Design a binder for this molecule. Structure first.
Ligand code: GSH
Length: 205
């Protein structure tokens, strides 16, 4: 009830969300630094081209390296040794450029929100209870959009291995499944853009 305790509970929660989210970032940065030659078997990177170029997302450029890093943010919880199998399923996606586009976007949107908040994680007390709450619910939701995307792609590995809905034995069903997945993830991506923006809006600091 007394506002000091409310305010401080919120500074506690933001503190913990911000460090948990920083651990995730230290982890996908490290996933890039230790990326082997074959990019964990994600051969789809080679098939994805910048806008009017022969440069792929597999090449050794800053923008290419960042695209794969943000993709590894989104895929961060999947076991590294399953990414080859994940890429084999997705190669069959009719919208893999767009799909991978959204992986990059969730990663980047995420990365921007934590890069903005990490340096301020101990000095959020200048905000007022209303828009400290909005900050916390916004960021926690952002973490959530990206987590769900990770769960969805993890689940696809098991469903495909199980032949669920005949996804393994029927290519047409695999395709519409993958298409539906891309719509789901695309919403999560749009929704993640709004929340990075909300967050940047109310935490100038
Ligand atoms: N449209 C690109 C992806 C664009 C996108 O939304 N992703 C972000 C992060 S991976 C991005 O392009 N960042 C690279 C940049 O902004 O230079 C695609 O279709 O594959």
């Amino acid at each position: 009830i007394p506002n000091k305790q409310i305010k401080n509970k919120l500074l506690d929660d933001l503190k913990n969300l911000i460090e948990t989210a920083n651990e995730d970032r230290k982890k996908y940065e490290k996933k890039l630094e230790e990326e082997p030659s074959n990019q964990y078997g994600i051969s789809i990177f080679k098939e994805i081209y910048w806008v009017a170029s022969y440069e792929t997302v597999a090449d050794n450029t800053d923008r290419s390296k960042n695209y794969r890093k943000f993709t590894y943010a989104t895929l961060n919880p999947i076991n590294t040794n399953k990414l080859a199998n994940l890429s084999k399923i997705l190669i069959q996606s009719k919208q893999k450029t767009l799909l991978f586009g959204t992986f990059c976007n969730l990663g980047r949107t995420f990365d921007t929100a934590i890069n903005h908040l990490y340096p301020k994680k101990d000095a959020l007390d200048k905000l007022e209870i209303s828009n400290l709450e909005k900050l916390k619910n916004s960021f926690e939701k952002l973490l959530s959009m990206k987590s769900i995307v990770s769960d969805m792609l993890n689940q696809l590995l098991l469903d495909y291995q199980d032949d669920k809905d005949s996804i393994k034995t029927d290519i047409a069903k695999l395709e519409s499944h993958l298409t539906e997945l891309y719509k789901q993830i695309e919403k999560k991506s749009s929704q993640a853009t709004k929340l990075k923006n909300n967050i940047l809006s109310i935490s100038n600091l």
